[PDB]
Design an enzyme around this catalytic site. Structure first.
Site, short mmCIF file in Angstrom:
data_model
loop_
_atom_site.label_atom_id
_atom_site.label_comp_id
_atom_site.label_asym_id
_atom_site.label_seq_id
_atom_site.Cartn_x
_atom_site.Cartn_y
_atom_site.Cartn_z
N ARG A 10 0.82 -1.20 0.00
CA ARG A 10 0.00 0.00 0.00
C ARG A 10 0.86 1.26 0.00
NH1 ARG A 10 -0.57 2.80 5.05
NH2 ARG A 10 0.27 4.55 3.83
N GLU A 140 -5.16 8.85 12.42
CA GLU A 140 -4.19 9.63 11.67
C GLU A 140 -3.68 10.86 12.43
OE1 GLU A 140 -5.49 11.53 7.96
OE2 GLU A 140 -3.53 11.08 7.10
ZN LIG Z 1 1.77 5.47 7.66
#
Ligand SMILES: [Zn+2]
Ligand SMILES: [Zn+2]
Lengths: 307, 307
Positions: A10, A140
């Site tokens: 990814r 995040e």
């Molecule tokens: Zn990352």
């Protein structure tokens, strides 16, 4: 005991000058799961493009064939129905949802209220479960969040603790943490939510990701993220080859990784990604074993090399 | 406050496929001291060969010209008069003596008694002072020594504490330490000898050298060793570029290094040594700044790049 999530496919797809063909991704995923024996692989980001959708579908077709379907994860976003629909069509069964983990990120990018955003989040998670998926959630910018807005972070985790998710990922997204800070951030949440499976996701910007990971283990983490050769944007992710070796030799925790496949994994990723590693790269570099008085537990045959 | 000793030229000369010409070594040494502003440079190992002797002489001729003579150090051995004579002829004024820092190394390599070896050591140090030199002493294999033979280590340091030396180097020669172990080993000696200038010398075999160094600082170290791009045998030394940045951003200690020269220093060493670094190499890699919401204290202009 500890789970290892590889994000080579990814994040690598994100790296400058890197793009894997369908066959390459398939080849790599197969090796990681069957040979290296990493627990799970995060192979793509939802909605990137068709072809990638095609690549994931081909990989899932194979996964079914080997009873490995649930070991493949797709990074997705809080975008209503888009990410979930994309994953549904891909054939993948696990969503790694990227949620704003710092008040600063939430406000500056979304300009939404915690409650409003948490609602968008609940929609995606519920729809995902409705669609037959399992969900892991990334906080995040958490590394900045718990240091600059611990209240927001606590409320976010609180909201997610009521949700039907599998794990919560604690990412040092911008790679700004020291080992001390990592232990503190992780310990702060593991104590409040002792019944949640947290995983630490380091970034190597200061060449501190493996050290941060060790402290993450100390704080109670049940899993860690990493990538082969640290492949990924910027300074990349925690280097899998060094992370695993260090966990095995310097901690009382364990991994399911087969050390003997480590060298071939590094060579595979290096050739296919086209991103060269230095000869002195820990554990995997060409000159790393060259020079019994000066012998380390780090022997070539241990990682499938020099025999 | 903290001193930084660069060992790029000495250890690099040891790296597989690496050999610097006289001009190259001179060019690099000049840059390290005048541009990067590292405190001292260890540029060669005594008795390696003529030419190297010539290279050091040319470098010293220049050093005098700039009042930098005492900032150049030569790694030497407990070999009676040989190392000291070699250094005398080289024009260098500082000896970094390699002494057996673990009982296991002493017995297996020299087959001598601690008292007998300490006597060989005293001979070299006295002769060195007689010859107009200053001495720093490496406790080779100390990382194994304080863990497997702390008695020998304590007696060695005790012996050296009575000697007229400038600093004692604590090297993780085989690169086997964790940050915790480093703090413990260093703390164990700094408390017993609070009046000695100790420096930590890490090796990156587990990608833990910068982290170990931070703990070394925590334990009371007054200096650290490192090399540009981690150049050196095996996994190399603590990477200077990342070590300095981490000290400046994640510790309350300081360095005299000029961050703006960091990029050119890395490029210089990479080209002259012929040892390529990866594009994701922390702080210095080509893709390290590529991808204000996602901004780290690690900016390109800070290290003389992208402007
Ligand atoms: Zn990352
Ligand atoms: Zn060394």
């Amino acid at each position: 005991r500890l789970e290892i999530l590889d994000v080579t496919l990814r994040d690598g797809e994100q790296t400058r000058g890197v793009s894997f063909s369908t066959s390459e991704k398939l080849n790599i995923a197969k090796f990681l799961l069957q040979k290296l024996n990493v627990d799970r692989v995060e192979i793509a980001s939802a909605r990137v493009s068709k072809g990638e959708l095609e690549t994931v579908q081909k990989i899932m077709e194979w996964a079914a064939t080997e009873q490995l379907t649930e070991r493949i994860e797709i990074l997705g976003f809080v975008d209503g129905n888009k990410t979930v629909d994309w994953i549904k069509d891909s054939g993948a069964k696990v969503l790694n949802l990227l949620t704003k983990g710092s008040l600063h990120h939430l406000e500056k990018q979304l300009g939404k209220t915690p409650k409003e955003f948490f609602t968008d989040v609940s929609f995606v998670i519920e729809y995902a479960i409705k669609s037959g998926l399992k969900i892991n959630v990334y906080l995040e910018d958490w590394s900045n969040g718990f240091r600059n807005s611990p209240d927001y972070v606590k409320s976010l985790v609180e909201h997610l603790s009521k949700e039907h998710i599998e794990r919560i990922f604690l990412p040092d997204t911008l790679g700004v943490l020291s080992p001390e800070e990592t232990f503190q951030g992780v310990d702060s949440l593991i104590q409040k939510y002792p019944d949640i499976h947290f995983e630490f996701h380091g970034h190597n910007d200061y060449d501190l990701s493996v050290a941060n990971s060790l402290q993450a283990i100390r704080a109670g983490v049940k899993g860690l993220h990493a990538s082969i050769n640290g492949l990924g944007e910027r300074a990349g992710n925690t280097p899998l080859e060094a992370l695993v070796t260090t966990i095995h030799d310097k901690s009382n925790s364990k991994t399911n990784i087969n050390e003997i496949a480590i060298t071939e994994a590094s060579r595979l990723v290096e050739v296919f990604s086209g991103k060269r590693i230095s000869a002195n790269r820990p554990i995997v570099g060409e000159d790393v074993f060259t020079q019994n008085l000066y012998a380390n537990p780090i022997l070539p045959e241990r990682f499938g090399r020099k025999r």
